């Protein structure tokens, strides 16, 4: 009755979970199109909406619900299994129903996370251009001890052309690319000097409104794998700093080729959480 998406063992999240670490008491904010809080395979602890006319506990798009399920779908006898199933999940709506949102709403969501004491921030979103305030917000959250993770982008490769987007391009943010179940780079995965690590982003099965499950493709799918892994690293070593968690993830990654295309490589949660 419960399905295990290929990405959980690929990054070896099942081995840390096996040890008894499943993200308990770690707070993760999913900044996205919201979350269908009523989904039976999810438990949303709280949140905030910075999008006019939509509450935080509803998700008219699906993107937010899918991403959240990858970070924390509940470990039970139904649906799917998240990377960090016992995490404290918070839905921070910064993108509307059409999957777009303003920089100020995004910045407000980042600051909210920061202020409410989140441990991890997932941003499965990107822009061609960043901004002063946005860099300000991610720099302060990082300096404040928050692990900021974002989707690198899905514009692929174009010669030695840097295709990484904002906010993944900022050095205080972990830029995550996408691989498939074969551990090969997804053709849509953005490339460039700032690419830091890779996670499963192709053919990812997760929670989807209403009360169902679906398969999506995107660096948006990869990011939550790293946000979840960071949660597992913290559940095991509550002591680590944001920089140390980050270092653990890129330092222990499985090499797959050139940094321009793969960053340090595919993450390996077992190794990083040693
Ligand atoms: Ca489940
Ligand atoms: Ca970055
Ligand atoms: Xe994205």
From Swiss-Prot:
Residues of the full protein shown: 106 to 378 of 379
Cofactor note: Binds 2 calcium ions per subunit.
Main location: secreted
Practical application: Used as a detergent protease. Sold under the name Alcalase by Novozymes.
Identification of the protein by name: Subtilisin Carlsberg
Catalytic residue positions: 32, 63, 220
Activity-regulation annotation: Inhibited by p-chlorophenyl and 1-naphthyl boronic acid derivatives.
Catalysed conversion reaction: Hydrolysis of proteins with broad specificity for peptide bonds, and a preference for a large uncharged residue in P1. Hydrolyzes peptide amides
Needed cofactors: Ca(2+)
Binding site for Ca(2+) 1: 2, 41, 74, 76, 78, 80
Annotated keywords: Calcium, Hydrolase, Metal-binding, Protease, Secreted, Serine protease, Signal, Zymogen
Listed EC numbers: 3.4.21.62
Keyword Cell cycle: no
Iron keyword on record: no
Cellular-component GO terms for this entry: extracellular space
Peptidase S8 domain boundaries: 5-273
GO biological process, one term: proteolysis
Similarity field: Belongs to the peptidase S8 family.
UniProt binding sites for Ca(2+) 2: 168, 170, 173
Single GO term (MF): metal ion binding
Localization (cell): Secreted
Described purpose of this protein according to its UniProt entry: Subtilisin is an extracellular alkaline serine protease, it catalyzes the hydrolysis of proteins and peptide amides. Shows high specificity for aromatic and hydrophobic amino acids in the P1 substrate position. May play an important role in the degradation of feather keratin.
């Amino acid at each position: 009755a419960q399905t295990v998406p290929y990405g959980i063992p690929l990054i070896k999240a099942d081995k840390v979970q096996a040890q008894g670490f499943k993200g308990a008491n770690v707070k993760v904010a999913v900044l996205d199109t919201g979350i269908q809080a009523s989904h039976p395979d999810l438990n949303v602890v709280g949140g905030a909406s910075f999008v006019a006319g939509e509450a935080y506990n509803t998700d008219g798009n699906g993107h937010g619900t899918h991403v959240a399920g990858t970070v924390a779908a509940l470990d039970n006898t139904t649906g799917v299994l998240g990377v960090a199933p016992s995490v404290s999940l918070y839905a921070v709506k910064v993108l509307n129903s059409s999957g777009s949102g303003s920089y100020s709403g995004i910045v407000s969501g980042i600051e909210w996370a920061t202020t409410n004491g989140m441990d991890v921030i997932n941003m499965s979103l990107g822009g061609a251009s960043g901004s002063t305030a946005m860099k300000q917000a991610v720099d302060n959250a990082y300096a404040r001890g928050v692990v900021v993770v974002a989707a690198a982008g899905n514009s692929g490769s174009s010669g030695s052309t840097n295709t990484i987007g904002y906010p993944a391009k900022y050095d205080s943010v972990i830029a995550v690319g996408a691989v498939d179940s074969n551990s090969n780079r997804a053709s849509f995965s953005s490339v460039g000097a700032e690419l830091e690590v890779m996670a499963p982003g192709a053919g990812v099965y997760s929670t989807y409104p209403t009360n169902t499950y679906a398969t999506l493709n995107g660096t948006s799918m990869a990011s939550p794998h790293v946000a979840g892994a960071a949660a597992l690293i913290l559940s095991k070593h509550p002591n680590l700093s944001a920089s140390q968690v980050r270092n653990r993830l890129s330092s222990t990654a499985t090499y797959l080729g050139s940094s321009f295309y793969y960053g340090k490589g595919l993450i390996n949660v077992e190794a990083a959480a040693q």
